[PDB]
Design a protein around this ligand. Structure first.
Ligand SMILES: C/C=C(/C)C(=O)O[C@H]1C(C)=C2[C@H]([C@@H]1OC(=O)CCCCCCC)[C@@](C)(OC(C)=O)C[C@H](OC(=O)CCC)[C@@]1(O)[C@H]2OC(=O)[C@@]1(C)O
Ligand SMILES: Nc1ncnc2c1ncn2[C@@H]1O[C@H](COP(=O)(O)OP(=O)(O)CP(=O)(O)O)[C@@H](O)[C@H]1O
Ligand SMILES: [Mg+2]
Ligand code: NA
Length: 994
């Protein structure tokens, strides 16, 4: 391996000590191969079903359930009555539930995918090398390519490794480095070295990246780095090193079981102490192990009582629906759990051009030197109409139509835009629209010529599929494109070498047409053309030129400027090495300015407003672009990131400025800044680190593998619909429409979902609290079981779930977007709210137990010891004549249970409603505010009545109710809950919170 790109062709050949015409020798291979290993990325790791199901049974709760299911299973086998043939339901059900979860997670993860897996899609199976054990090129498996061997690639091949170019055989080499950046635009590779050792891939012009494709050409090169050491290999490392935390909800839940667990074992401790009398009174007689079974079978009740068995199903079904929802709004969210974290986004870093703007360019202004005399200088500003690349529009001066032709400067300005352009227009029939062909900024300048036919030629007499390129075509035939000197970020500009068409324009012949950033060119300008005539560049005219350029790109116009020039007497062709880049800037000098051109990348409509929502939302927004700081800011102002006259010194940095700062200040800059200019590689990733240090939930965008590491590290990495596959696999969400707006919209659904989600959680949990109270009392008093796990299950899963998932559709608040994002550290239940369900539950636990016990005493269908003796119901068949007098089995009666449970059910269909709002009376927030909530409650009730009226179902449970004598009892017990709440709710007025 080596830092080749900085080293010369010979330097690399020496390093690895290899022959360019021979290749590595079988010894060198074995050696190298050993030292560097094979050319591939470590394999994937995926827990087997075993490992899966094992974690599926790793949750403390699911564990607690498994133990519980066992105990029950053990207890069922301990009877010996033919009628106790139902005992195998309780355990069998729990297991189903448990199992069903495992069945999910296994099919869940199962259909997932790693972004690191996506990368291996870039690893081409074969490759071509030249090794000493043969003279012709060998076609071997990339896996076996080694650092140092001479490699060969061409037109269709996928570059197998990070290769330094040794020699280009075709007349030109082109590469599609999009898997890296995403830009489909091919680039030209050379052979000479690049000085900077810390140079970004972009400027490694003599380098070939493992993953990219050869757009056009054929070349020979020497392998620099392999496997994980290659540009793409580094990324894979970063993405694997990165660890993503759990959704705050998943956090909050794990925290719940952790506690749910401690309480449980504590109750057993209390319970045991309440029945500790058995150490000083027991007649050491029989029923000693008919008492153990009690504390045991009462345990598994306690468990299913404690766990919100159905919650998981509710949540997931909620998230899915919302997902499917967001999808309609163009937000493609991949992991359901994200929807939570999304609704909490603190900061959003959005790339500019693709999402904030439309990436649809068009020239608005022009300006050619009109007159220079003394210090008196006069320009010639214009305007151009038409936002589509469409050839439809008019050139104007002071908003008055004009014939570009009448001016010379323009005629040239035009020919330059027509010959220093590697793009083109095209018209499709499928959707009758004018489509860009080359690059955005060029495919525009071409549109600029069509709109301004400098030599008034027909056209209106031509079809659209001809009109698109019929003014350019003309200028293309007045001069000959000898070759071009490509754009390189060093000299920020480009130029085409031209010779005329013999006898028609051979006045001076060989010309050089250059376009590029205004700064660069204008310096390299020693003359200015005042329409068909030249004058030496001079102090004032230069200032006038630049000045307008600043206004155009800083002013409300926010335009991108391309100063245009031509080299009247270029050097002689033979005096030019068209294959080594350093000399281009030298070739593009002693120039004559012929005009600058401005163009606009229009923010999207929804942006202006979305940007405002976020403000309202207290969600910060940061733009990341490639625009010079000066312009970056201006555009930030035009959209609302900044105020028209707001101070921004400390709020917007440039990629470089940022490096020149210390890890300390670096951090500050981030929590306050809102605009990053020309940001290099790591910057994205680093910024996500500083925005996380302040514990902010942040979103990132981007689409090439270059940004996979940031997308993975952001709390919500965001990919583009038209982005690459890896980026997507590395992202939590995907804007099918690439639109910034789509982001916010989504952030909002997330805030809505959670609110409702949040409620049904509180709903289910609370009941689970009361269920336990019941089970406690039932054991603290000694009273016969009031409720059975089975019943309980059915409840928490169905009778209670439907209303839960129903509340999921709770209409959204109105100020959802006027409130700061939620703090992740916000507990679902605490304070006075803790107190309410502290109460409610305590109520159901009394209501329930009381009701069943009621049937025992005070009931007209099986009276009982109104003296409370029922408490020793254990002792019945024992001392029958010991106050018993009657049938020793009424305790095992079914009706008393059907009491305590129907009291529960109703108390829930009730408490369900008390949850439509956390603090609003129902007289304020009526139950019909959500029809599903009511619609479901009914579905659950009929269901309840289904377990009673069917014949199979009842047997597993309790018997029917005696409506009006027994049912009314239920109601005079339950309904009162609503009030208890309303009362406690009303306590929201007597305090200061609303
Ligand atoms: C589900 C049923 C029960 C009985 C339970 O043990 O819940 C406790 C518990 C673990 C918490 C408490 C429960 O505390 C009690 O109910 C007191 C025990 C008295 C009954 C014993 C009879 C002798 C929650 C349920 O209830 C109230 C209202 O007091 C609210 C909340 O839970 C949530 O926000 C849900 C988490 C998704 C948690 O305080 C939570 O602890 C936490 O870490 C939280 C933040 O989680
Ligand atoms: N095809 C081209 N040839 C020569 N100069 C060009 C050009 N396209 C743009 N320019 C000018 O050169 C300067 C830089 O070009 P560069 O290719 O880095 O821009 P870019 O802003 O399009 C990158 P990004 O796509 O990330 O926003 C620009 O600021 C512009 O003034
Ligand atoms: Mg460009
Ligand atoms: Na992520």
């Amino acid at each position: 391996m080596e830092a080749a790109h900085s080293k010369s062709t010979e330097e690399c050949l020496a390093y690895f000590g290899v022959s360019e015409t021979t290749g590595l020798t079988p010894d060198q291979v074995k050696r190298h191969l050993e030292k560097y290993g094979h050319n591939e990325l470590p394999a994937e790791e995926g827990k087997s079903l075993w490992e899966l199901v094992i974690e599926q049974f790793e949750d403390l709760l699911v564990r607690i359930l498994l133990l519980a299911a066992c105990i029950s299973f053990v207890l069922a086998w301990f009877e010996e009555g033919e009628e106790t043939i139902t005992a195998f339901v309780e355990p069998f059900v729990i297991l189903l539930i448990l199992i069903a979860n495992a069945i999910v997670g296994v099919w869940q993860e199962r259909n997932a995918e790693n972004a690191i897996e996506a990368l291996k899609e870039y690893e081409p199976e074969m490759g071509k090398v030249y090794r000493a054990d043969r003279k012709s090129v060998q076609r071997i498996k990339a896996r076996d390519i080694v650092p140092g061997d001479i490699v060969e690639v061409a037109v269709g091949d996928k570059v197998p490794a990070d290769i330094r170019i040794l020699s280009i055989k075709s007349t030109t080499l082109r590469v599609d480095q999009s898997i890296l950046t995403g830009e489909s635009v091919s680039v030209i590779k050379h052979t000479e070295p690049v000085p900077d050792p810390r140079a970004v891939n972009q400027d490694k012009k003599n380098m070939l990246f493992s993953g990219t494709n050869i757009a056009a050409g054929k070349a020979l090169g020497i392998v620099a780095t392999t496997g994980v050491s290659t540009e793409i290999g580094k990324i894979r490392d970063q993405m694997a090193a990165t660890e993503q935390d759990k959704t705050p909800l998943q956090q909050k839940l794990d925290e719940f079981g952790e506690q749910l667990s401690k309480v449980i074992s504590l109750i057993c401790v209390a319970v045991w102490l309440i029945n500790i009398g058995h150490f000083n009174d027991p007649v050491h007689g029989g029923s000693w192990i008919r008492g153990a079974i009690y504390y045991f079978k009462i345990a598994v009740a306690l468990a299913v009582a404690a766990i919100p068995e159905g919650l998981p199903a509710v949540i997931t079904t909620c998230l899915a629906l919302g997902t499917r929802r967001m999808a309609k709004k163009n937000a493609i969210v991949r992991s359901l759990p994200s929807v939570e974290t999304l609704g909490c986004t603190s900061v959003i870093c959005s790339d500019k051009t693709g999402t904030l703007t439309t990436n649809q360019m068009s020239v608005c202004k022009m300006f050619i030197i009109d007159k220079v005399d003394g210090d008196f200088c006069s320009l010639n500003e214009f305007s151009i109409t038409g936002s589509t690349y469409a050839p439809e529009g008019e050139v104007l001066k002071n908003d008055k139509p004009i014939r570009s032709g009448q001016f010379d400067g323009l005629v040239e300005l035009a020919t330059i835009c027509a010959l220093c352009n590697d793009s083109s227009l095209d018209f499709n029939e499928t959707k009758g629209v004018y489509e860009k062909v080359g690059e955005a900024t060029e495919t525009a300048l071409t549109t600029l010529v069509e709109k301004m036919n400098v030599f008034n030629t027909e056209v209106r007499n031509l079809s659209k599929v001809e009109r698109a390129n019929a003014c350019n075509s003309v200028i293309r035939q007045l001069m000959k494109k000898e070759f071009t000197l490509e754009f390189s970020r060093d000299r920020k500009s480009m130029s085409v070498y031209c010779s005329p068409a013999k006898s028609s324009r051979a006045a001076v012949g060989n010309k050089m047409f250059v376009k590029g950033a205004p700064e660069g060119v204008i310096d390299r300008c020693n003359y200015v053309r005042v329409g068909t005539t030249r004058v030496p560049m001079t102090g004032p005219v230069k200032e006038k030129i630049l000045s307008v350029i600043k206004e155009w790109g800083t002013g409300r116009d926010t335009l991108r400027c391309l100063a245009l020039a031509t080299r009247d007497t270029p050097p002689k062709r033979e005096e030019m090495v068209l294959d080594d880049s350093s000399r281009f800037m030298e070739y593009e000098t002693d120039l004559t300015f012929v005009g600058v051109v401005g163009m606009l990348d229009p923010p999207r409509k929804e942006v202006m407003g979305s940007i405002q929502l976020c403000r309202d939302a207290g969600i910060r927004v940061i733009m990341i672009t490639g625009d010079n700081k000066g312009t970056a800011i201006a555009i930030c102002r035009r959209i609302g990131i900044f105020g028209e006259n707001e101070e921004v010194a400390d709020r917007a940095y440039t990629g470089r400025e940022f490096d020149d700062l210390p890890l300390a200040e670096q951090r500050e800059a981030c929590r306050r800044a809102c605009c990053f200019a020309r940001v290099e590689p790591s910057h994205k990733s680093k910024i996500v680190e500083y925005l996380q240090s302040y514990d902010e939930i942040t979103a990132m965008t981007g689409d090439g593998v270059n940004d996979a590491p940031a997308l993975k590290k952001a709390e919500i990495g965001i990919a583009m619909g038209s982005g690459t596959a890896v980026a997507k696999t590395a992202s939590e969400m995907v804007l099918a429409d690439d639109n910034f707006s789509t982001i916010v919209a989504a952030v909002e659904e997330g805030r809505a979902i959670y609110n409702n989600m949040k409620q049904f959680i509180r709903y289910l949990i609370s009941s689970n609290v009361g269920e336990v109270v019941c089970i406690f009392l039932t054991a603290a008093l000694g009273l016969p079981e009031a409720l059975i796990p089975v019943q309980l299950l059915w409840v928490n899963l169905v009778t209670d779930g439907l209303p839960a998932t129903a509340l999921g559709f709770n209409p959204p608040d109105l100020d959802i977007m006027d409130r700061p994002p939620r703090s992740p550290k916000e507990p679902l239940i605490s304070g006075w709210l803790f107190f309410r369900y502290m109460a409610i539950g305590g109520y159901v636990g009394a209501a329930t137990v009381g009701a069943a016990a009621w049937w025992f005493m005070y009931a007209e269908d099986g009276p009982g010891v109104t003296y409370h003796q029922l408490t020793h119901f254990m002792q019945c068949t024992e001392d029958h004549p010991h106050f018993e007098g009657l049938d020793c089995e009424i305790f095992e009666a079914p009706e008393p249970m059907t009491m305590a449970l129907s009291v529960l059910v109703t108390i829930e269909m009730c408490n369900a409603l008390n949850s439509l709002s956390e603090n609003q009376s129902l007289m304020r927030m009526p139950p019909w505010v959500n029809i599903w909530l009511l619609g479901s409650i009914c579905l659950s009730m009929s269901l309840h009545f289904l377990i009673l009226y069917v014949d199979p179902l009842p047997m597993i449970f309790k018997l029917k109710a005696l409506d009006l004598t027994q049912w009314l009892m239920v109601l005079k017990i339950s309904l009162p809950v609503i009030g208890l709440d309303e009362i406690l709710k009303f306590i929201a007025r007597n305090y200061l919170e609303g």
